[PDB]
Each structure stands twice: as structure tokens, then as C-alpha cells.
Design an enzyme around this catalytic site. Sequence first.
Site: not given
Length: 475
Positions: A145, A147, A150, A166, A185
Site C-alpha cells: 500500500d 502511495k 502513506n 501505515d 489502492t
Amino acid sequence: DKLAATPGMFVQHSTAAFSDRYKGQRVLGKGSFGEVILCKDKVTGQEYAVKVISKRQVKQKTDKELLLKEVELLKKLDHPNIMKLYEFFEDKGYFYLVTEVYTGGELFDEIISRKRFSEVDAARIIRQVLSGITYMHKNKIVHRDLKPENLLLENKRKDANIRIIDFGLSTHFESTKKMKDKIGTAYYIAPEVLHGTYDEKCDVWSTGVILYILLSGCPPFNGANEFDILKKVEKGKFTFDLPQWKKVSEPAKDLIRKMLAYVPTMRISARDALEHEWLKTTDAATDSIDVPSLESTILNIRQFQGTQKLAAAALLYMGSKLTTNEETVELNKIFQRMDKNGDGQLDKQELMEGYVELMKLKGEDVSALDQSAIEFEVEQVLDAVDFDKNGFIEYSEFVTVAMDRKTLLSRQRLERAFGMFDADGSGKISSSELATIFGVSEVDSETWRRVLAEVDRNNDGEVDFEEFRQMLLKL
Ligand SMILES: [Ca+2]
Ligand SMILES: [Ca+2]
Ligand SMILES: [Ca+2]
Ligand SMILES: [Ca+2]
């Protein structure tokens, strides 16, 4: 049974109350799960981020297991570009995660303010990301995850350092079995994850998507909505067809293409992406680097005499847990530079080369160096500084040892350190308390002997706050 001092062994160790260590300042976020509070350490005045979770928020047994698991990941990780976990507490009805505060906010928000990044800027940023994940991937952890949402910038300076965050969708991985859960995502998630079989290479794909955005301000795969994005993604085709790309150099494109290789087997690993010329070439020459800082750090390292376990733990705690980011900025530079292969560890070769690189800058001639003498010295430094005895010098270990002792051994730090060891508040450190901090059933009579004869002045069989002081302050 070599007692390994690790930053993580300190984490779950306190079981005090929130207010025993902290004073709240303001709320940093609330979520259904819990809130993040900006707190001030009562003793040190330092500023921390404390996430507070109601037991009621997470009593899904999977969920307790899930959180405890994110905790064990974080205890393990130690890298200049990855989130640092300081403490894990428990209450009658609450869990507390004390994290470092990152004052720069999200890469996202920095994206939606300037839109496009300088090639120099973007390489530096991405370089850090990949170093984080090279480290993670090496240690059998895949994030799943990535991005700008994050990634956080540590502070507000123009070329601030980046931190990965995270780890709630992150997991452990074994090369032999492929992962299956569909997690990620829309814009960033890699095709194979949709298909149900994927590997750590998905993190590369995501980083590749991130890099595309940084350089052009737009996703490479877009859609009216999530669903339309996913279809675009799964079909796999993207293009550098935007006018924006006219300005950007071909290798950067080359890297992008290697990171968004459709099939994981043909997609570049983090380790290898790190070596891409662009990342290589964006550094036109070593940025001006203080030789004095470098010389003093190398000097502070050489002079760290090997030491008994009480002092070792004490120092590693102080280094890893009690140092402000402002405090270690230059050091983490040198570390990263030292760590050619990116994996977030220093090895014999990398250390040896560091010293040699320093020598020439001192102008010393490299064919004139007792290479076999350096090697020996390096072998011994590693023996001295390798607190967890894995044969590598990790970033926490590095900072502990490279920092000016006088600066590190501030009074607040000292006080607090003693506090952590002396769990019964007796004002005196027992071998049992030592064993507890180390995470082990008992300490070898061996090791306790070898520590008292060097610290126990009263000769009461224990170490008090002044005995403690002298031990460390004995340069
Ligand atoms: Ca390395
Ligand atoms: Ca080590
Ligand atoms: Ca005690
Ligand atoms: Ca004593």
C-alpha cells in the site's frame, strides 16, 4: 546464547500509564479506530505522536492479532526512511502506540500544491522510498500500500527526508508461497494483486506509479471512478504521451518502464532499481558533504570500546529511542552514503570503503594504506558496535555510536534511561531488571559479574542512578 541488544526490545517494556510519561497538547487526528494525540514527554519536553486505541475499537480477535502484528513489524524495522516506533503501552481499556512525529504532512498534499517535481527532487525522494523498501523486502516484509498518502515528509524544510507509514496492510512474506489477499489502492495497485497471486514486487509497481505522478502530475492509469481505473490498470498499457513528458529525460522513463513491467518476474527489484543511472546520475557529484562531520563520526566510531551489556543496552536505548530527528539529520546522511547497496545495513566492505573514501578526501593516497591494518580495525569496530551481534551495523546502532557522546548523554536522556531499566522504581538496577529489558528469562551470572566489577561502587549488588551515570560518563 548471545544477548542481542535491539531497538525493538525496548518497545513493549514499559507498562505504565499514559500520563506517567506524557502530557497531551492537541489532537492530530481521530478515526473510528482511535485518535493520534500530539504529546509532550513530561521529562524531556520532546514531542511525540501517540495513537490511542480503545479496546472496544478493536476487539475483533483477528483485529487484536492484527494490531499486535503491526507492532511486531515496527519493533523489527529500523531505517532512516521508515516509520520509527518508540513505545507500546497498555491500559485497562486502551493501547498506546508512541510514534515519532512527522511535521511535514503527506507527500499527497505537497503534490497537490506544486503539481510537478524537479527531476533532481523526484530522484532524491524516490531514492529514499526504494531504500526503505529494499530494506523491507530484504527483511521479508512487503508493504502492499504505497502511495503519497502513506509517505510523510519529516519536517517542513525544502528537501526534507521522507518516511514510509501505515503498515496496517503490510505483511510478512516467504519467497516460496505467494500472497493472495486483494489489498491496495486503485491508482497504485499492481495487476498481479488483482489476479490473486502476487509478490513483494507489487511495492515496486506502486513506487513506479508514484514516480510517474511525481514527474508528470498525473496518474499513468486513470478512470472516471475506481472501477474504471482498475480496468485500465489490469489491461496494463500506459503511455508517456502527455506533453509534460517532453521535458523529462529518457532514463527516468527507462526506470519508470522497468518498474511498471507488467509481469512481476520481469519487473525490476528495489535493490536493482536503486542502481538505475538516473538515481546514480541525478547526483552530479557528491553534494557538498562536511568532511568535519564525517571525520568526527568516523572518529566517534573508532573510539567506541566494546562494552558490558548494561551499558550497551543503555546506549542503544538512548540512541534509538531518545534522539530527536533534528539531532540525527547529518548522521543519517552519512549512513545512507556509506550504505551503497541501500539495504539499510553497514557491512565490513561498506565500512571499510567509508574510511578509505574519507582518507582520500583527507588527500591521503589510497595505494599507501595498510589495507590489512584497516580491515582489522574495521573487524573490531564491527565487533564493538554490532549490538545485536548479527554481523551488521544497523542504523540505530550507527546513531548510538556515531553521535557525540556528550550531546547524547544529556541529563534528561540519562534520567529517563535509568527509569526504563529500574522497573520497580527502587532506585537500583537488578540483574532481573536487566534480563527483563533484554527480553530474556535471566542474565548469565557471567554477564552480571562482568558488569558489576565495572560499575558497582557501593558494592550493594546493584546499579543506582549515580553508579549508572559514571559508567556511561566514563567517556
Ligand atoms: Ca549494506
Ligand atoms: Ca547489528
Ligand atoms: Ca529495581
Ligand atoms: Ca550499587
